[PDB]
């Protein structure tokens, strides 16, 4: 609450100093706990002021004027703290109104490759530190993977679409500045099977609950039994889920076999008793005949004949008592048996109606991670799960493009300029680009630094789209190999009227096979106008890229009619299909932690490259080639906020380097 809220909303602990701060304020962190708590209030209070209104540049003069002693006291420390938050982009980022118009005495020159959000965030920061910044993008528009489709009042995002909570999200600040309209998302999502009828409710829950367990089970499998390598090869979340399901199937059988083997041991005991009772009956039979024969010797008989009746009479009432007690412990075993033959264990682990609803839960996972589960690291797929924001996820009714468009305002963005070669040396860098329209036309940009927001997809392509001169060193390229670049596609269906449940944000279709859990597995409304997004995920995303839009929209209306009626669902006015893996300025959707990657590759991807020296025996040059992007930020990968933070970061790194540290 208050000073502490601002720390948390700035992704920082109010309690204690970060590593970034230890680096810049070693005097303090190594010094007494008293001076640390001062530092910490100034930092938190300075942040609070920024956030409390982030449409106005917050100056040094301003912050000092709204501290009060004892913190107010040391006006150097306050100016250091203010200038630290300024670089590292914790305050005065996004769209502020500058109070002092930045001077035209621009110092140092930087080429930024790509009008990413990462690109634009950095561009704006470097500009506000008074550097000379030019952005070079291949596309005919800014935004990159923040692509929004307009056509009349119809507006739908084919790229980033969701603000994944405002609780510590830097986009929380950008939304106040840009006045983009955020609508909430009710995550409740009814399923509907292939046949087109809502999975009933008690099913929905049995399967979800079982999904949620099966995951937790891979986590136990990973951390507890250390099942993370198998035949010299890293285990996938996929492999682990199969090995868990195969074992839950194997326990169902072990369980039946244990139960029938227990019935059989009872029947083999009832048998040992019947064999005994049948030998006593046929022996009693014999003895009774002997008693009647002896009993029928009419008296007056002597005493041995009298003893013979009296004896046999006993010997029989004895064997009759044995067989009465064997026949009671018979009637116990026939109940023990009507008990067991009435209380079986479970027949199956999952039916095929079940194993298919489970497959829709695996598509939702394949959709979120933008890749088949066969590719996700078992040890590391959920590494960023610590830094997830707070509050409900939100769509942008407005269309997310409204952000990068607003970030672009005031930058030297050269559009339709495909970078082809980045050359970096002791004395500086040349970027060589071409006009994407007429490609013979060649452009040369000279600069002190190159900032590369090139997507991991592009960085991966062979033969390469962009050549580095000299080559990126193994440690960098190896990381680009190890790291995963995924895929996820949307289908935009604009109708004339709403024929779905307006108070339901999303709903799912369950495919008939595992092999296509992903094919049009889920449907959103923007709900503003009558639009339905349909997501393609998993192995499916990749394959549906070679299938005409008419066919995809066919499979779509097919499904929708299944669920809502035939005369209910009209033809769409307008349809679009994303084909991200095909798009050569993307080569896919966003990063993922592949098996045999870690989070540590995200860190390699951010470390800048320092050229060798030009004259042998010459001071160690400065770093020249820097990297930002969704794929460079360990704790917030594959997002917009992660991009935006990665840019804010490389801006600091480059100013620290070329304008000397604050």
């Amino acid at each position: 609450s208050g000073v502490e809220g601002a720390a948390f909303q700035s992704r920082l602990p109010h309690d204690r100093m970060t590593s970034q701060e230890a680096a810049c304020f070693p005097d303090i962190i190594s010094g007494p706990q008293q001076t640390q708590k001062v530092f910490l209030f100034i930092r938190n209070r300075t942040l609070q002021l920024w956030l409390d209104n982030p449409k106005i540049q917050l100056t040094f003069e301003a912050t000092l004027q709204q501290l009060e002693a004892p913190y107010n006291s040391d006006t150097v420390l306050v100016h250091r703290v203010h200038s630290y938050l300024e670089r590292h982009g914790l305050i005065n980022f996004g769209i502020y109104k500058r109070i002092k118009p930045l001077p035209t005495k621009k110092t140092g020159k930087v080429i930024i490759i790509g009008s990413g959000v990462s690109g634009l965030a950095a561009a704006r920061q470097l500009q506000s530190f008074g550097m000379d910044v030019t952005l070079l993008e291949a596309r005919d528009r800014v935004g990159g993977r923040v692509a929004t489709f307009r056509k009349g009042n119809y507006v739908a995002d084919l790229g980033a679409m969701v603000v994944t909570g405002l609780g510590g999200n830097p986009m929380a600040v950008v939304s106040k500045q840009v006045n983009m309209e955020l609508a909430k998302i009710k995550q409740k999502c009814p399923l509907y099977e292939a046949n087109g009828q809502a999975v009933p409710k008690e099913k929905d829950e049995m399967v979800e609950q079982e999904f949620n367990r099966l995951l937790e089970a891979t986590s136990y499998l990973s951390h507890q039994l250390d099942f993370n390598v198998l035949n010299n090869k890293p285990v996938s979340l996929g492999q682990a889920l199969e090995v868990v399901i195969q074992l839950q199937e194997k326990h169902v059988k072990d369980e039946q076999i244990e139960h029938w083997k227990k019935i059989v041991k009872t029947q083999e005991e009832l048998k040992e008793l019947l064999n005994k009772m049948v030998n006593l009956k046929e022996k009693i039979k014999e003895l009774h005949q002997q008693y009647k024969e002896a009993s029928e010797v009419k008296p007056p008989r002597d005493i041995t004949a009298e003893f013979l009746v009296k004896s046999k009479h006993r010997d029989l009432t004895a064997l009759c008592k044995e067989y009465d007690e064997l026949a009671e412990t018979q009637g116990k075993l026939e109940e023990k048996l009507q008990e067991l033959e009435a209380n079986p264990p479970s027949d199956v682990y999952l039916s095929s109606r079940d194993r298919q609803i489970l497959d829709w839960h695996f598509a939702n996972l394949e959709f979120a991670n933008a890749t088949p589960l066969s590719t996700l690291s078992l040890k590391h797929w959920d590494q960023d799960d610590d830094f997830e924001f707070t509050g409900s996820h939100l769509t942008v009714r407005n269309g997310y493009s409204c952000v990068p468009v607003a970030l672009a305002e005031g930058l030297d963005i050269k559009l339709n300029t495909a970078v082809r070669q980045v050359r970096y040396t002791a004395s500086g860098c040349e970027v060589i680009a071409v006009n994407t329209r007429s490609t013979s036309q060649t452009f040369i940009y000279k600069c002190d630094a190159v900032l590369c927001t090139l997507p991991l997809g592009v960085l991966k392509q062979q033969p390469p789209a962009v050549q580095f001169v000299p080559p990126l060193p193994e440690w960098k390229t190896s990381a680009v190999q190890r790291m995963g670049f995924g895929n996820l596609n949307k289908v935009v269906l604009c109708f004339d009227r709403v024929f779905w449940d307006p108070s339901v944000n999303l709903f799912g279709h369950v495919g008939s096979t595992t092999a296509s859990r992903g094919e049009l597995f889920l449907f959103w409304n923007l709900y503003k106008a009558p639009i339905l997004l349909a997501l393609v995920a998993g192995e499916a995303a990749g394959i549906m890229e070679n299938i005409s839009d008419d066919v995809i929209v066919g499979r779509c209306l097919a499904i929708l009619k299944g669920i809502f009626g035939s005369s209910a669902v009209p033809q769409p006015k307008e349809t679009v299909v994303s084909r991200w893996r095909a798009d050569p300025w993307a080569r896919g959707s966003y990063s993922y932690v592949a098996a045999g990657s870690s989070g540590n590759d995200y860190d390699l991807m951010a470390q800048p490259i320092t050229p060798g020296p030009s004259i042998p025996g010459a001071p160690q040059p400065i770093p020249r080639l820097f990297f930002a992007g969704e794929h460079t930020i360990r704790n917030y990968p594959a997002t917009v906020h992660g991009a935006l933070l990665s840019g804010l970061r490389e801006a600091g790194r480059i100013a620290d380097q070329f304008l000397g540290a604050m």
Binding site: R213, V264, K271
Partner: protein, 134 residues
């Protein structure tokens, strides 16, 4: 969590065994399926072996049971009951419970009293040696 979620079973042993080969998964699962069969077989077998043995037992022993007489045991033996006893001692040995039942009107203790009073005159000694032979 040292414990897997509740209901899910994941032994170190079991995991190694469903991953020591590509198909070792669904050979382990067949060689159980092909044994859930081979029990269910030997159930029906013994169910039928057992229901045969029940129709071989279809009268109880009701036509063979002897109605019983209450027997208010006496002090005086009688020469009759003395002779029944010596013959029962020859037949049953020390089963004082049987020797009582045979005679009819003597508690198990009176049978011991006898066993020691007439030990002399009925050579009960000589008699139990003859019983031990059998």
């Amino acid at each position: 969590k040292r414990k897997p979620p509740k209901g899910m079973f994941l032994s170190q042993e079991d995991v190694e065994a469903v991953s020591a080969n590509a198909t070792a998964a669904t050979t382990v699962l067949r060689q159980l399926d092909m044994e859930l069969v081979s029990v269910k077989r030997q159930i029906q077998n013994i169910k039928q072996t057992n229901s045969a043995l029940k129709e071989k037992l279809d009268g109880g022993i009701e036509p063979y049971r002897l109605p019983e007489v209450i027997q208010k045991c006496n002090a005086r033996w009688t020469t009759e009951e003395q002779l029944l006893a010596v013959q029962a001692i020859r037949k049953y040995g020390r089963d004082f419970q049987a020797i009582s039942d045979v005679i009819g009107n003597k508690s198990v203790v009176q049978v011991k009293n006898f066993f020691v009073n007439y030990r002399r005159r009925f050579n009960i000694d000589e008699v139990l040696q003859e019983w031990e032979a059998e």
